[PDB]
C-alpha cells in the first residue's frame, strides 16, 4: 500500500484542508524530478518540443471545445473583473493556442508538443485514493499535430514509446484496452468510426492483444489505455493514446498543405506514464518501496561504529556527493545493527559501514536493504559501479 | 522591448482569453528550464531541500495566516462540495504544512526549503505588462526555518546567493531597497522593530547602499528588495529577502530546542531571481535577445550548401547533440546565405557551414550571430569549447 510506504519514506502527505492535493516532501519530489529527467531524455530522442501553457483560460474557450457542456462537473472555475475562468483539466486547448501562433505548413508536420501539464479535475471526494486518484496532477502529456497520411506512423510512435519507457521499470502485466465512444461526445459517427478503427489497426499491426471497453472514451476521442495494477490487483489507466478529429477544427487550427489549401490538422493526444502522481503510486506498490537505485531518494547512507570513524565518514560522504550520488552520513551514537534496520525500513539501496579496518585500508563495508552483506570493497570501485547502476537506470543492484 | 523580441524569437505569447497568463513556446520554455537547472545547482551548493506544495488550499487556512483579511483582492477562489479554496498566491503556508509533518528539533535547523512555486495573483488588468507583471508566475522561492541566533548567518546566506547568482548575468545596476512595516500587518511592533533592524544590519555588514521604502513591506514582514531596470529604466523588484516572526506561530510550527522546550522557528522568505517570468523579461531586454550560449534556445545550427553535404551535416548534428549541445540541422533547399541570415536574426550563437572542403577535411566553418567569422575548425575543438562556454555559463562567446 503506497500510502503507508509513502509515510514511512516521507515522500508526501495529504491533509483535509486540501483533498486530493499532494504535498511532495523532498524525497518524493526527488523521485518525481527523476521521472521528469527520464521523460525528457525520451522527448529528446523522439523529437518532441517542450512547452508550458497557462493554468487558467476564459470559460468562453472551454465552451468552444465542448468541455463546458461535457466536462463541467469536473472543472474548477474562478473569476476576475466579471469574467469566468476555468482551471485547466487538460493541456490540449493550451497546445492548440500555441500551434495557432504563426502560419503553419505541411513542412512543420508532424509537430510533437509535450508538456508536464498541471491538470485539475474536481473528482468526487469519495473516489479519491492516495496518489492514484487525485484532484491536482501532472500529466507527462503531448499533442501531435499531423496529416491523415501520418496518423499510422505517429500512433505507432506513441506505442513504441510506451513499451520503450515501461521496459525500464520492468513491466510484465501491460493489459491494453480500447475505450470507445461515450454517450456524450463531439464529432460525427464517421469521425468516431475512423478514429476507433485507426487505433485498433495500430494495436493489431503491433501484435498487441486488447479488449474493447465500451463507452469509456473521452468526449473528444477514443483511447488506447495501458493498464497497470496495484497490490489489490485494481486496474489503473496509465499510458494513454487518443485520436481526435474535432478539437483542432473547433479551435480553428489550420495549416497550408502542398496543394496550397487550408487543411485542419489531425491531433493525437498521449501520456506515457499517465500522471506522475499515479505512476509513482503504482511504482511504490510494484516495488514495495524498493525503488531502483536511480529513483531512490537516498541512494547511499554511510555509518560509523564509534566517534573514531566520523572523520572518515564525512570525507567519504563528500566524495560520493561530488560523484553525483544522493548520499547521507549517519553519525548517531547508535549500535550499527540499529542503524541498518532503520535505513532498511527507509529502503536505502546501499549502506556503507566504516569500522577501524575500513578507515585503515581506505575501504568500505557494503550492506544492502535486502539484508545482503557484500563485504569490504575499494571506494573507487563502489563509486564507479553506483554510477553505472544509475546511468543505465538498472532495475537490479550489485549481484542480482 | 521584450514583448517584440519575444514574438520575433517565438519565446512566448499572450492572449485576451487568458490575461496575464504566459503561453511558453518551446524556445522560451528552454530558457526557463535552463534557469531552473542553474537555480538547482545553487540549491545543491547552498544545501536547500526542494519540495512541491499544492495549488489550492482551504480558504480557512488563508484566514488563519491573515491573507484573507490582508490579501483577499489579489486571490483567486474556487469551490468544491460546498467548500471554498484559494489558488495559492504564495508558497510559505504550504512549506509550513510540510515542516509540521514529523517532530522537529534544533538539530534540523537551519532548515532550507526551496520550491519553484506557481503563484497566482489577481493583479488589476491595467497594471499588467508583458512578462514583468503577470497574474500567473513561478517564484524561485524558499523558506528557511531557523533559530534567533541563526538569523544573521542565514540572511547573509541569502544575500551572498543573490550577488552570486546575479554576477552570472553581469548586473551592474543592483539598487537595493528596504521595505518597512505597512499600515495593515500582523505581528507586534517589537517584532517589526527587530526584523527591520536585522535586515538593515545585514545590508550594512555587506556594504550595500540602500534606500528605505517606507510602508511597502509585506503584511507578514519587511523586505530587502533587489531592483533591476528594463530598457526604459523602469524599476522592477526581483530578488527579495524577508524576515517573519508571525506566520509559523499562526500555523502552529514548532521545534524542540536544546533546553528541550517548544520554540517557534523564525522564518526567512527569499526569492533570488524573483519570478522566472519577470527575470526572463529583464534578461530579454538586457541582452536584446542575444542570450549567452548556455541560455540560448538553439545553441548551434548546422547548414549544408547543397544536397552533397546533408549526410555530413546529420552525422555532425548527431555528434553535437550527444555532446549535450542544443543543435539543429538546416537541410532546406535554400541558398546558404538565406539560411545564415535566418539563424542570425534568431540570435543562434553559432552557425556551422559545411561545404565540400569541410566534408573532405572533417572540419566545419564557424560564424556567429554577430557576423564574426571564425574560419574552418576541427570539430572536436568546437565541441570542447562549446562545452566549456556552457559549463562555465560565460557571458561572452568564442569571439568577444
Ligand atoms: O488531451 C488530454 O486532455 C488528455 C487526457 C488524458 S486522460 O484524462 O484520458 N488520461 C489520463 C489517465 C490518468 C491520468 C492520471 C490521473 C490521476 C488522477 C485523476 C485523473 C488522471 C491522467 C490522464 C490523457 C492524455 C491527454 O492528452
Ligand atoms: O517567499 C517569498 O520570497 C515571498 C515573496 C513574496 S514577494 O511578492 O515579495 N516577492 C516577489 C518579487 C517578484 C516577483 C515576480 C512577480 C510578482 C508579482 C507579479 C508578477 C511577477 C514575485 C515575488 C511574497 C510571498 C513570499 O512568500
Residue numbers in the entry:
A (entry chain D), B (entry chain A): 2 to 401
Provide text from the study.
Aminoacyl t-RNA synthetases (aaRS) are ligases that conjugate a t-RNA with the cognate amino acid to ensure protein biosynthesis in the ribosome. The enzymatic reaction consists of a two-step process, the first involving the formation of aminoacyladenosine, and the second featuring the transfer of the amino acid from this reactive intermediate to the cognate t-RNA. Threonyl t-RNA synthetase (ThrRS) is one of the enzymes involved in this pathway, and it has been validated as an anti-malarial drug target. Here, we present 9 structurally diverse low micromolar Plasmodium falciparum ThrRS inhibitors that were identified using high-throughput virtual screening (HTVS) and were verified in a FRET enzymatic assay.
Attempts were made to co-crystallise these inhibitors with PfThrRS to enable experimental structure-based drug design; however, no crystals suitable for X-ray analysis were obtained for the Plasmodium falciparum ThrRS isoform. Since crystallisation condition protocols for the E. coli ThrRS were available, and since the ThrRSs of the two organisms share 94.7% sequence identity in the binding site (within 3 Å from ThrAMS; 89.2% within 5 Å; see binding site sequence alignment in Fig 14A), attempts were made to co-crystallise the identified inhibitors with the EcThrRS, and use this information to guide compound optimisation. Crystallisation experiments resulted in the determination of the crystal structure of the EcThrRS-7q complex, which was resolved at 2.08 Å resolution. Structure analysis confirmed the docking predictions that the compound binds in a threonine-binding subsite and that the salicylic acid hydroxyl and carboxylic groups coordinate the zinc ion (the heavy atom RMSD value between the crystallised and docked pose is 2.54 Å). The binding mode of the zinc-coordinating phenol/carboxylic acid group was identical when comparing the experimental crystal structure and the docked model. However, there were minor differences in the conformation of the sulphonamide group. The sulphonamide group was slightly twisted with respect to the docked pose, and besides binding to Arg651, it simultaneously forms interactions also with Lys752, Gln766 and Gln 771. The discrepancy between the binding mode of the resolved and the docked sulphonamide group was the result of Lys752, Gln766 and Gln 771 side chain mobility, as the conformations showed by these residues were different from those in the complex with ThrAMS. Structure-activity relationship study was supported by the crystal structure of the complex of a salicylic acid analogue with a close homologue of the plasmodium target, E. coli ThrRS (EcThrRS). Despite the availability of the structural information on the ligand binding mode, targeted incorporation of hydrogen bond donors and acceptors to mimic the adenine of the substrate did not yield compounds with substantially improved potency.
